[PDB]
Write a protein that binds this ligand. Structure first.
Ligand SMILES: COC(=O)c1cccc([C@@H]2C[C@@H](O)N3c4cc(C)c(C)cc4N(C[C@H](O)[C@H](O)[C@H](O)COP(=O)(O)OP(=O)(O)OC[C@H]4O[C@@H](n5cnc6c(N)ncnc65)[C@H](O)[C@@H]4O)C4=NC(=O)NC(=O)[C@@]423)c1
Lengths: 133, 666
């Protein structure tokens, strides 16, 4: 039913090597050239990528900011309320970001904010303005 | 196999089945009830046993029936009828046995036998055994044909056949007990040595050999599963198919280097696009940090938009730093998935210059086995006789194989130095015109009822004829003669004044420089008591070394042997002999092979006898008059001594059946 193992012999490949006298040499020269071809686009992207890798030297370590550890609080101070309205305008719906702007306010309180202080802070128009941008 | 069933196996016969031949002589038994068949089959097997256990004396019907026990000895005619069939077709009482019943005083019919090869001798023995008048015409000054044996002092080395291919069902087994043949098993170990003279390392030898055998199975798969047996209206040869297989393995080595490096580009390019996001991100980060400093430089106390700027920028740079952290994590996984592939590359080549040289030695071994370039063997059929391999180790004949012809020859009317030049066969008999080899003018005429031709196939092939048939052989026979292949291998016999090789090694190889010389002095045999090395010349080398002097040839032999054992340990040879079988006019080659475009059925054509037309038109359809035997006429055992011998037995059976009748069919 099947060849010895590792031997590669399908009906398609035998015909393509018998079709003429040097039809053997041709298709094994087609392949030596298709492999020189690939081994230097290897070496060319391996060199392009050596240059892009030179630009990332140092990573972004000068560019970090320390982690502020601050215990989450319940009451909304007026300053915190004001930050939220501005965060809403700069984002809108990304409660995780807003939670990170205000710093001492979790993502559930932010969503609860959205409807508690909804009238008084006119959160409705605010999101309309964000969507235009 | 043992018992009665062993005798049927040792006689190349199914112990539990009637053969096509036995059907022809016992059409009653085989179309009859299954019980009679087992009786018959036992009677055959029992008789064969009796002969086999002591083949130095004749086995008479009386001796036979006596040692059968009932119910089997209840029918004397069935026993008499079995024993006679066996005796006729040379299954019992063939070779050299003392008779019990001395020969019929007067002889019946006359048969001329061309050639005293083993096949000649074997029929002649049998025909004389049957009360016929037998004369053999032999062109050489010696019996044996291609069983040649050099003899000089204690030096003995055959130039022709030298190997008995295993006694498991071999007729030579029986002949070995009849004649004092010293049979020494070979030892199978064959160390290869390349042209430099260094031994090939064990790991490489095993690697190549297995590839060799895997390449053979591959050709078989191309033949029987892919039906790759015609190429541009011509039969595919074995050699072509091996190329097509080797090419497709070199193809696949390249197909898979390509696919592997194509995995590195597909990943070096995922990395490129990711270094691009990371260089761009380290720029949105560089300015957004700048922006955060400036916002943080504004000193407090701040209004809330100015305070929201710092917080928003701080959050954004943190979010943007999460991103570049995740990306330098992917960037760490792909830079390792690229070193893993780099250190796990697939094989660079299919076979190197050096491996392909050692493989060429294994191809020279096939070229020796079939005495022909692989480019000529039929891919479909070159091994059609594998099913009938004997069992056991091969052996050599250590006192010379010639001892067998010479033994068979004793008692027979043999005209040596008589070359047949014309065979004339007519509805009323035959005449053979022969001449003296020493003086061609002397001319001889032999009249006979039948000619048994055992001319080598290379002789029968010769253009212009060495032997003219009158009337000419029908086209169906001459086309079989053209289609078949008649190969060539030669031997160099080196006689020394000391053993300087491994005495516990019977044979050892020598790897060729090039494909074209893979056959040139590729193997050496240490077979004999005396110090004789014996060096083969196979494949395309065989036909070309015949145009080169003995001394140029022994020189290359000495060279090769120097490289393997060093110049000091290899002396000049005392005696040297170099064969040229293709040059020999009584052989024109060495043995036959299934050429591309031929088949084993051509061997059956070579065996059919010739029946001349009628003398008087409208006279009754005549008898067959011209019969053929020899190595090329036996389908299941060609190019061997045992096949030669069996074909002689076969013709002697059917000539006797024809000219003495056969009562065993009633
Ligand atoms: C698939 O399997 C394998 O490939 C195989 C398998 C196993 C072993 C072998 C081998 C290989 C080798 O190692 N050895 C061998 C070596 C050499 C060099 C040679 C040359 C042969 C062998 N034979 C073959 C064996 O030799 C022969 O096939 C056998 O001898 C045939 O005999 P024949 O048909 O009777 O024919 P003839 O030629 O002998 O007689 C005819 C007579 O006609 C005379 N006449 C001519 N013209 C005229 C005329 N005009 N008038 C009157 N007379 C005339 C002529 O003078 C001659 O005398 C081997 N066989 C083995 O078994 N062992 C081996 O050992 C092996 C291979």
């Amino acid at each position: 039913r099947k060849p010895p193992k590792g031997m590669f012999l399908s009906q398609e490949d035998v015909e393509a090597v018998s079709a003429n006298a040097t039809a053997a040499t041709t298709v094994l020269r087609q392949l030596d050239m298709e492999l020189v071809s690939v081994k230097r686009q290897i070496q060319n992207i391996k060199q392009t990528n050596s240059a892009l890798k030179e630009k990332l030297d140092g990573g972004i370590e000068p560019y970090r900011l320390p982690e502020v550890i601050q215990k989450c609080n319940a009451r909304w101070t007026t300053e915190e309320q004001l930050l939220a309205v501005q965060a809403i305008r700069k984002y809108g719906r990304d409660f995780q970001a807003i939670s990170d702007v205000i710093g001492n306010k979790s993502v559930v309180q932010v969503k609860n904010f959205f409807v508690n202080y909804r009238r008084r802070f006119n959160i409705d128009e605010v999101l309309q303005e964000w969507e235009a941008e | 196999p043992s018992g009665v069933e062993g005798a049927a196996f040792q006689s190349r016969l199914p112990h539990d089945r009637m053969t096509s031949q036995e059907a022809a002589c016992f059409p009653d038994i085989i179309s009859g009830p299954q019980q009679t068949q087992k009786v018959f089959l036992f009677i055959r097997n029992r008789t064969l046993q009796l002969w086999l256990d002591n083949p130095k004396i004749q086995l008479t019907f009386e001796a036979t029936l006596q040692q059968l026990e009932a119910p089997y000895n209840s029918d004397t005619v069935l026993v008499h009828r079995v024993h006679s069939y066996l005796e006729r077709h040379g299954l019992i009482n063939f070779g050299i046995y003392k008779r019990i019943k001395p020969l019929p005083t007067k002889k019946t019919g006359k048969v001329i036998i061309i050639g005293s090869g083993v096949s000649g001798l074997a029929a002649a023995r049998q025909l004389q055994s049957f009360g016929m008048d037998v004369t053999l015409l032999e062109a050489r000054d010696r019996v044996g044909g291609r069983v040649a044996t050099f003899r000089k002092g204690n030096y003995v080395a055959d130039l022709g056949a030298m190997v008995v291919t295993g006694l498991g069902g071999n007729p030579m087994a029986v002949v070995s007990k009849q004649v004092n043949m010293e049979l020494a098993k070979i030892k199978q170990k064959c160390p290869l040595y390349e042209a430099n003279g260094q031994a090939v390392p064990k790991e490489k030898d095993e690697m190549v050999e297995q590839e060799f055998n895997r390449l053979l199975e591959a050709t078989s798969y191309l033949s029987h599963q892919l039906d790759f047996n015609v190429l541009n209206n011509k039969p595919v040869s074995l050699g072509q198919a091996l190329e097509v297989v080797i090419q497709l393995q070199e193809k696949h080595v390249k197909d898979e280097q390509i696919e592997h490096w194509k995995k590195i580009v597909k990943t070096q390019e995922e990395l490129k696009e990711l270094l691009n996001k990371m260089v761009n991100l380290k720029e949105k980060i560089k300015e957004l940090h700048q922006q955060y400093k400036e916002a943080s430089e504004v000193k407090p106390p701040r209004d809330i938009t100015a305070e929201f700027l710092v917080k928003s920028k701080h959050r954004d740079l943190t979010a943007l730093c999460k991103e570049y952290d995740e990306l330098a994590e992917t960037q760490g996984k792909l830079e390792e998935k690229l070193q893993e592939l780099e250190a796990n590359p697939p094989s660079d080549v299919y076979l190197s210059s050096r491996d392909r040289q050692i493989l060429d030695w294994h191809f020279a071994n096939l070229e020796f086995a079939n005495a022909t370039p692989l480019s000529t063997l039929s891919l479909k059929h070159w091994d059609q006789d594998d099913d009938f391999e004997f069992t056991g180790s091969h052996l050599t004949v250590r006192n010379g194989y010639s001892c067998v012809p010479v033994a068979l020859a004793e008692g027979l009317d043999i005209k040596l130095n008589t070359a047949v030049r014309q065979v004339r066969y007519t509805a009323s008999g035959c005449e053979v015109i022969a001449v003296n080899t020493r003086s061609t003018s002397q001319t001889f005429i032999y009249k006979c009822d039948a000619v048994l031709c055992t001319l080598p196939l290379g002789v029968l092939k010769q253009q212009p004829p060495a032997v003219q048939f009158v009337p000419p052989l029908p086209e169906w026979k001459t086309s079989a003669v053209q289609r078949m292949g008649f190969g060539n291998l030669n031997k160099v016999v080196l006689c020394f004044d000391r053993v300087f090789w491994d005495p516990s090694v019977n044979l050892f190889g020598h790897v060729g420089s090039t494909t074209a010389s893979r056959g040139e002095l590729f193997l050496f045999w240490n077979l004999y008591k005396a110090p004789i090395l014996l060096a083969l010349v196979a494949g395309e080398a065989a036909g070309i070394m015949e145009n080169i002097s003995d001394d140029v040839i022994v020189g290359r032999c000495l060279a090769i042997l120097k490289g393997i054992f060093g110049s000091s340990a290899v002396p000049q040879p005392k005696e040297t002999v170099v064969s040229r079988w293709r040059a020999d006019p009584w052989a024109r080659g060495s043995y036959s092979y299934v050429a591309a475009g031929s088949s084993g059925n051509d061997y059956d054509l070579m065996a059919q006898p010739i029946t001349p037309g009628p003398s008087i038109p409208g006279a009754p359809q005549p008898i067959p008059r011209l019969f053929f035997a020899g190595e090329h006429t036996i389908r299941n055992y060609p190019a061997t001594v045992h096949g030669a011998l069996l074909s002689g037995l076969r013709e002697a059976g059917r000539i006797a059946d024809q000219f003495l009748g056969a009562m065993y069919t009633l």
